């Protein structure tokens, strides 16, 4: 019985993101996650998902969801992914 | 909403058709994309 809309702003609508080596993590809990409003906050170049359906998402529950915010170069966008290698994947941010 | 509606809009009823605000200045993700679905039915049916 929770009706507080989740603050999906302050991450996508944020003015300036954090550095790569200092990626910020925001704890998100005690809310109703409406992922439909994310598609209209900003254009999307890639919306890859791992293990979870990109569309069948508004009908699930989560213990804790952490949004990692960082800006990388355009040629290294393929590096942020589970199991990938590179400078960012080794010294800046590595996904399990 | 639960209140009945009419030919005009209301606080609890709106038009189901929304317009696309397609603008060439939008980045990748909001630009218009044409989709052509070529449905095929390949089977033992008489092919034309």
């Amino acid at each position: 019985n929770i009706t507080n809309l989740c603050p999906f702003h302050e991450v996508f609508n944020a003015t300036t993101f954090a550095s790569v080596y200092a990626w910020n993590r925001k704890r998100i809990s005690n809310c109703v996650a409406d992922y439909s409003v994310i598609y209209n906050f900003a254009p999307f170049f890639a919306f890859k998902c791992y293990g979870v359906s990109p569309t069948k998402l508004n009908d699930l529950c989560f213990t804790n969801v952490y949004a990692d915010s960082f800006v990388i170069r355009g040629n290294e966008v393929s590096q942020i992914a589970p199991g990938q290698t590179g400078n960012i994947a080794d010294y800046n941010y590595k996904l399990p | 909403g639960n209140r009945p509606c009419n030919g005009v809009a209301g606080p609890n009823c709106y038009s189901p058709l929304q317009s696309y605000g397609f603008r060439p200045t939008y980045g990748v993700g909001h630009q218009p994309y044409r989709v052509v679905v070529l449905s095929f039915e390949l089977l033992h049916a008489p092919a034309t």
Partner: antibody
Framework: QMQLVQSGAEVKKPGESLKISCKGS????????IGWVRQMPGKGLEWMGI????????RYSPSFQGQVTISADKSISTAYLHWSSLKASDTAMYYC??????????????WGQGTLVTVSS | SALTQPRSVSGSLGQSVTISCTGI?????????VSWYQQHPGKAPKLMIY???KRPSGVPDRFSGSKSGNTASLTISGLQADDEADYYC?????????FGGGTMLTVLG
């Protein structure tokens, strides 16, 4: 030196849809976000929106999504303002602002001299 | 959120005074999205304080500030005749710049 001189003051009747412009110089008017700020006489500043010179991407405040439209001309480095259905309460001072290399893209670094818009019958 | 400021403040020449600024939001990347502008009567506002830990070029060093939760303050040392003007604090964390209700700085003489 960099200059952001705007157009002269104007006085029109409600419903004439006047146009205000601003001429910038001293910098590359292709990559710096430029916008306008509205201020009524005796009150605080009210930001309306901004525009990018390279591509006409516009970001409007929720209180100015349809009350005013912003356009720019990269070929002459001139921004423009246009209104529709001017009301009696729409008269206010309008200040322009640019991004600048001081802070972020949204931080207003430099300001113009201001253009007074008078609306009365 | 909307920024709130004291409408009228008082001071004196050669003394120090502080201007409060409340209602500042916070986004991912820090809470330093606070800026100040000074607008003389009949003139355009001038950027005096942005990235409060820093100051722009040409701005006198007598202006300074600090952050404390959701409330910011602007400190001025050595009030002079040219300091008698309006001041507006601005927040730009949510990709939207908002301004307070304005402040009126008066000094005795």
């Amino acid at each position: 030196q960099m200059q952001l001189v705007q157009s002269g003051a104007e006085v029109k009747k409600p419903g004439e849809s006047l146009k205000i412009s601003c001429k910038g110089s001293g910098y590359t008017f292709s990559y710096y976000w430029i916008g306008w700020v509205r201020q009524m006489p005796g009150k605080g500043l009210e930001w309306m929106g901004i525009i990018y010179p390279g591509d006409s991407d516009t970001r409007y405040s929720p209180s100015f999504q349809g009350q005013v439209t912003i356009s720019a001309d990269k070929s002459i480095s001139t921004a423009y303002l246009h209104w529709s259905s001017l009301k009696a309460s729409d008269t206010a001072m309008y200040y322009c602002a640019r991004q600048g290399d001081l802070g972020d893209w949204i931080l207003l670094g430099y300001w113009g001299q201001g253009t007074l818009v008078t609306v009365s019958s | 959120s909307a920024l709130t400021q004291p409408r009228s403040v008082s001071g004196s020449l050669g003394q120090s005074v502080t201007i409060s600024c409340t209602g500042i939001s916070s986004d991912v990347g820090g809470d330093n999205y606070v800026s100040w502008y000074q607008q003389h009567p009949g003139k355009a506002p001038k950027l005096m304080i942005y990235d409060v830990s820093k100051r722009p070029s040409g701005v006198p060093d007598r202006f300074s500030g600090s952050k404390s939760g959701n409330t910011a303050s602007l400190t001025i040392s050595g009030l002079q005749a040219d300091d008698e003007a309006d001041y507006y604090c601005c927040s730009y964390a949510l990709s939207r710049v908002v301004f307070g209700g304005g402040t009126m700085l008066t000094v005795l003489g």
